[PDB]
Amino acid sequence: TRFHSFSFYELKNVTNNFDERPISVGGNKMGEGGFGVVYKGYVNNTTVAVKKLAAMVDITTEELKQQFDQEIKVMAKCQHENLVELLGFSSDGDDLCLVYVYMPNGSLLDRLSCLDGTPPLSWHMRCKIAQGAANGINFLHENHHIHRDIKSANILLDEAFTAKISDFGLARASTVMTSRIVGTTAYMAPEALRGEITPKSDIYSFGVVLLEIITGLPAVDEHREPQLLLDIKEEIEDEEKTIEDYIDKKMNDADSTSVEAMYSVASQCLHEKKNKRPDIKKVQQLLQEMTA
């Protein structure tokens, strides 16, 4: 797959000169991460998401360029209904830009937090999102790709709340070790925090996502006990609590049987030993069985 090459000035123009104000006040900024800001745009008779890369954290200009290239490379090779669609990019201008099909319902992270007053996701919608995201990860793993940044902020939701895996800047082709440890701490497997590069780490991070789906709680909350959501697995196992005590109250269609079935998948994904975790095909099978 080869992409459209956009002019920097066309992208600057359709995003109201990269307006960093929220949508609600007439701005174009929809969200931001460590490697960039995503703006709403309208190009070639289509609402788009324009990601302008900028860091914002570490970051070598070459590192950011390597993430820009990595994202285009993964998107050229990987097209799936549970992955975001890249339309094009921009290099000619000062800032590096990535153009995608606009995701009207933004990120799973924001929908779980009901950011800006959006209604809570039903359990029925949550099951479809979990299945869809697992189908997207399966496609990446089948195509020998390791995401390395699986999190609710990197699971986007379309006009039908279909799960779309996004933000492949840190993705790697396929156990190897790295001197540059990258990812989101609260979601990272212990071996990934140590430098290991394995698809087994993506499974662990997906386990954290499944806990966010069941509970509606963020992966990390400094003003909460436990601060890290993954610690709930031990509180439940050590029988101090049950998964029912953690179920998101912002749902009226969640039955205990299917919630326990999703929790069982999350628990298995969150095994501290990488080799004891299920592979993505097993995760898919179990999530499909959950709604059958």
Ligand X SMILES: Cn1cc(NC(=O)c2cnn3ccc(N[C@@H]4CCCC[C@@H]4N)nc23)c(C(F)(F)F)n1
Q: Which of 19, 95, 110, 149 is catalytic?
A: 149
Task: For residue 149, indicate whether it is catalytic.
Answer: yes
103 binds ligand X (CB under 6 A): yes
Quote the tokens at residue 281.
């095909």
Q: Which is nearer to ligand X, 48 or 232 (CB)?
A: 48
Phi, psi of 113 (to 5 degrees): -85, -5
CA 164, CA 133: separation in Å to the nearest integer? 6
What residue type is assigned to position 234 of the chain?
A: E
- Name which of 38 and 232 has its Cβ closer to ligand X: 38
User: What contacts 26, CB < 8 A, 6 or more positions away?
Assistant: 19
Alpha-carbon distance 20 to 253, whole Å? Answer: 37
Bridge partner residues of 96 (DSSP): 53
- From residue 142 to residue 181, the character string flagging contacts with ligand X as x (rule: CB under 6 A) and all else as - is -----------xx-x---------xx--------------
Closest contact distance (angstroms) between CB of 62 and ligand X is: 21
- Consult the annotation and say whether 31 binds a ligand: yes
| Annotated binding residue 101 | no
- Shortest reach from residue 275's CB to ligand X, in Å: 30
- The residues facing 53 across adjacent strands are 36, 96
Question: Site mask, ligand X, residues 62-101, x = CB under 6 A?
Answer: ----------------------x---------------x-
The two tokens of residue 286 are: 């179990």
The answer to whether 248 contacts ligand X (rule: CB under 6 A) is: no
Q: Which residue has the tokens 């998101």?
A: 248
Contact 39, 19 (CB under 8 A): yes
Which residues participate in the annotated binding site for ATP?
30-38, 51, 151-154, 167
By the criterion CB under 6 A, which residues form the site for ligand X?
30-33, 38, 49, 51, 84, 100, 102-103, 106-107, 110, 153-154, 156, 166-167
- Which of the residues are catalytic? 149
